[PDB]
Design a protein around this ligand. Structure first.
Ligand SMILES: Cn1nc(C(=O)NCCc2cocn2)c2ccccc21
Ligand SMILES: [Zn+2]
Length: 140
């Protein structure tokens, strides 16, 4: 589990969005596993605007914060889960790290702010859905 809170926006894994998030839907993309909903209160998270490939992510399955190098976002074939059939996921960044399904929503951060959230993993990899291209998140 986990969310990004910036202005009056909540960013979650699409597969972990609630009844309430769909009712308050701003924007979603199945191929990115991203959903954004409106909030009452103002969030305190800053979105990174950069092309950083180094950072730190939270791993709930280890209660630890791991420093990693990650690839630039791309279209990547991802195997089936509970939530999606085997498919191509877009805007996905991979790193060498431990992850399990419940680690989804863990935040990846660089010196500039929040980069993305855990979405994919296994075989010693972790996949992050990038949010740095969603410039509209910093306004309105
Ligand atoms: C970080 N992590 N996430 C999942 C997962 O099932 N994601 C569901 C969402 C999804 C995206 O594309 C297909 N399914 C996973 C599975 C084994 C090990 C680590 C893992
Ligand atoms: Zn950065």
């Amino acid at each position: 589990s986990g969310a990004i809170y910036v202005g009056n926006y909540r960013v979650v894994n699409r597969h972990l969005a609630t009844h309430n998030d769909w009712a308050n839907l701003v924007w979603e993309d199945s191929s990115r596993d991203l959903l954004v909903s409106s909030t009452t209160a103002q969030g305190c998270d800053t979105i990174a605007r950069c092309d950083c490939q180094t950072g730190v992510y939270y791993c709930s399955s280890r209660r630890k914060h791991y420093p990693v190098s990650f690839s630039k976002p791309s279209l990547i074939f991802v195997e089936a889960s509970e939530y999606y059939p085997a498919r191509y996921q877009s805007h996905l960044m991979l790193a060498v790290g431990h992850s399990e399904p419940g680690d989804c929503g863990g935040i990846l951060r660089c010196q500039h702010g929040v980069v993305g959230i855990v979405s994919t993993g296994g075989n010693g990899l972790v996949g992050f859905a990038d949010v740095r291209d969603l410039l509209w998140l910093d306004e309105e």
